[PDB]
Assembly symmetry: C5
Homo-oligomer: 257 residues x 5
């Protein structure tokens, strides 16, 4: 079962994370910005697909989007960069296991979250400058999707955030339990497919959604309050799924007590 | 290497009962995770089912099958405890004298209940998303639960047998390869076959019923409908996993 | 290359097969019964697919069926069970290499064939009992396909059997020439796709087609006499394909020239 | 990067090929016959697909055909059998690197070619015997395709042959540059997808196209001369792509100078 | 983590490239010509797909094209050949790490670029010679796509170039961080899926687009000056994405400070 070995690996990763931040904020933030941008790249692609297929009235739209999102977290895992959603399980487990403090945990969460946002912001501006969202079905897909995410009840967003980060974090969990990089990507592929097509909410992906929506002059269905509204609810949900379910879960499984 | 496989099944059976005797909390938490992991596969393919049924696609059941792999892949990759696979493992470990019938029924009971706890928690949180307040996906849960609860016992029993043959044989494959990619592929193929052919999985049905019982959508379900199905399918699962795969692997491996 | 090493492996597999049989008819038939069952599972899957897409008039039908048949031989290989079709190459090669005898070989063929049949019969009974073949497009796909295979001329069935088992056996051969379990599954997937979609005939798989069809009470248009006819033609087909083509072929490729402890190449 | 290692591998494979022939022509011809038939099996499949989908009026026909051809060269690589096409790169590089003579190379080309043809003749005979090409969309697909290939201008077949064997040989090249069988199969899959769907000409695959079309009693409009014409032009193109592009290219990269 | 190890690897690859160029321009240009031709092979394929599916009015056209482009960078990685785009990250990182100089970097960029073009030119001549772009939906797809690429505003081309090479270079980065060839190909497949389908601009792929369009007598939409316009704007964007984002970024993560 290797639950102790697994918890031992998560504890080390938590430690390595807080060490990296303490050693160099610039390294930690660049890492976070890359992850934020890598996740956003998955959004650019599946929203392009969403625009193309919704316009055709395809029934496969949300299925093809889910199948196509794999790159988001695959890039993060293969580049070894810092993403807020994964850090919910990692810091949580390492903290319960006395590897790191609550303060360390807050630091890592806040810095990776802000760094992820910087990467989303950067990608958004650049994407807008491509003219790819000047007008047409892709722009319209950004605008409609952003508006629907911004107007869902808090409770619904919260609970979707929870299920989303159980899925993200369990695929990160899998990556700590296999030595086959191909098996890692596959599990990531399956988990992102499940969470996208099922309708769960990913805070870091949402940053790029609102980034593009706000920066684009052609899109005007949502405001910054809406963006912040959705981001807060979903982030809170993400934290609950990652730390309360996956982090506590893996702690309980591996703790020699 | 049938002998070596039998030994692996036996050692796994021993670790299972050892875990339970050491910590119920750890055993049940492992079980609740597995029940949740399987349920997640159900959320995915019922979302697909809803979407494609609404559109009248003839591919509906085929896509549902192709998309169920995550269910058991997560269980295997996380090393957690699912009732279905435990039928073969404890059954073979028992015939091979690593564990007793008492241990076997303890494991089955605890993993079954733990799986259910996972299903219930998943159902609650999923209903809370608002994703099945109304529309084709909500309707797919209601209709699918109702057709499953109204099936004759015999039909459910036999579908339970074939389903767990498929689940247990993919577990067996996972014991006969060192490749995790090969493991996931075999699991993918076996789940594809059981979902699309129309076989019945007791743990997955737990999420089907917890979702339906928690959602405000008015089905024709009832708790007695769910229990009826779960009982018939569980017994079918036990026969397929213990009598076929369990006994079968003992016979191939037993250095007599 | 590495044909001699492969030939030794085939030979060893043959020796182990007969050793096992001699040691335990029960162990051997149980292994064969699983394989028949594992192959049949593939049939239950692709026939469900066939039923669904035929009923919808989809042109993709036979393509999707072929793409979805991989589970059949993949389960056999990954479970190390005994399937008649594969045994045709292995026993054949092992014999030519002085490892097993014509006697041992016909025994394995007979025992694995009957064993595969036991697996199909059980699966058919169990499957029919699910109610999934009571009525509808899948029941009909079984009935119609069972009828078309049994009403086909012997020559067509025979040659279809040759090509089927060439593919089945070459995929088994690939599994002897790689250490990667994933490459094994992929190669099996490719070969089973080719053979199902192109329309070749597989004897063990046909055992499940007729078992489900004979055990089913949704009409007939069949006859256990029709099944036997098909099973016989296809089986002889599978035999030459696996033994005359793949078996002899691998022997020739791998037989060290210095032996020559009986025959000379050129 | 390991170009010299690679050229050493090509040269050693070329030496092993001419040694096999000198040692045993029947072994060599049996190996070639297997290769010719393995390739032909790909044609039987994708022509069935071609038949089915052409009859459907589907725009995906040539795409699905391309994706389904991988079995052809995968079988050859995994069985270690002798196929003419790939032999163009291997014997030319090994020759340029002074491991084999010009005479050896032409012996290997002639024998693998005649051997491949023998494999295709056997397959086409057995295939017609199945009654699968007595009538229907598949028989027709065989009949039309054989006729369109035979009536093509020489220059067009020649250049198609070149690009086909660049793709065949580069995927044989990859097979020498990885120790992963899965990676090998994937590259063969991508390259065969590419050459089929783009419309390039493969001499050995054509042998099976013409053995079926000509051996089939259900009529057509090919003729033996038409078959020979296509085979000569495509074979010449295959040689140029494999030897002059891939062979010479890999020699230059890897040559100890 | 292992950023430092990754940076040593890039630096070492940078050193190996400049050494190869100094030792033999021929070996280096031939490697470059191959890569340009390998990338162009992906263009030939996905443009065939584009013609077929556009002609049929399929809404899957752009998605199937992206899914089918993996062969381009897969060949380059697996054959170990020199492509300009990937060189933007490798050289810039190697140079920042003091392994190679600014002069080495501009020399590698210019030679790989020109080498890639030669490969593009050679492929274009030969593809035209196949008769495959004589008339019909595929020739039309080249013509229309080349025109639209040449008539796009500079800023749009530039930013598309940035996002394209971040995707190309990150897949090259992943290839440096795994020992699994299969995982390399998967990551390449994903990144190329993302960049094609999203609409980003690849300078080396574009050389074949204009190669085919210009050499063909039946295509009359673009002109040489148009190709140069596109190639300049896109090459500049590619450089920024590979060197400024990816190169500078992996240095910062990796630099033992
Ligand atoms: C939330 C708590 C769930 C606990 C489930 C316990 C189910 C009890 O189940 C019983 O356990 C006994 C030993 O304890 C065994 O001897 C019996 O075979 C078994 O039926
Ligand atoms: C649908 C077909 C999927 C093929 C995916 C192949 C992924 C290869 O993945 C590799 O498989 C090897 C097994 O040989 C393992 O040893 C390696 O650890 C693993 O990385
Ligand atoms: Cl993530
Ligand atoms: Cl399960
Ligand atoms: Cl088989
Ligand atoms: Cl070939
Ligand atoms: Cl590139």
């Amino acid at each position: 079962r290797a639950h102790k070995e697994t918890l031992d690996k998560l504890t080390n990763a938590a430690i390595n994370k807080i060490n990296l931040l303490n050693t160099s904020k610039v390294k930690y933030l660049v890492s976070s910005a890359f992850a934020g941008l890598y996740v956003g790249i998955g959004i650019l692609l599946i929203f392009t697909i969403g625009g193309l297929l919704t316009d055709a009235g395809s029934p496969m739209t949300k299925i093809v989007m889910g199948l196509s999102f794999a790159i988001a977290l695959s890039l993060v895992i293969m580049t070894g960069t810092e993403v807020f959603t994964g850090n919910n399980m990692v810091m949580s487990a390492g903290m319960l296991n006395k590897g790191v403090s609550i303060k360390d945990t807050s630091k890592i969460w806040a810095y990776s979250w802000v760094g992820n946002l910087i990467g989303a912001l950067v990608l958004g501006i650049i994407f807008v400058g491509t003219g790819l969202v000047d007008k047409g079905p892709v722009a319209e897909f950004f605008a409609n999707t952003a508006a629907s995410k911004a107007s869902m009840p808090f409770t619904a967003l919260f609970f979707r955030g929870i299920l989303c980060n159980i899925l993200v974090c369990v695929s990160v969990l899998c990556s700590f339990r296999t030595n086959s990089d191909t098996a890692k990507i596959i599990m990531i592929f399956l988990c992102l497919f499940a969470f996208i097509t099922s309708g769960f909410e990913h805070s870091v992906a949402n940053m790029t959604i609102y980034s593009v929506s706000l920066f684009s002059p052609t899109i005007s269905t949502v405001t910054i309050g809406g963006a912040i509204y959705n981001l807060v609810a979903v982030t809170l949900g993400n934290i609950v799924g990652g730390a309360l379910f996956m982090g506590l879960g893996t702690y309980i499984l591996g703790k020699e007590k």
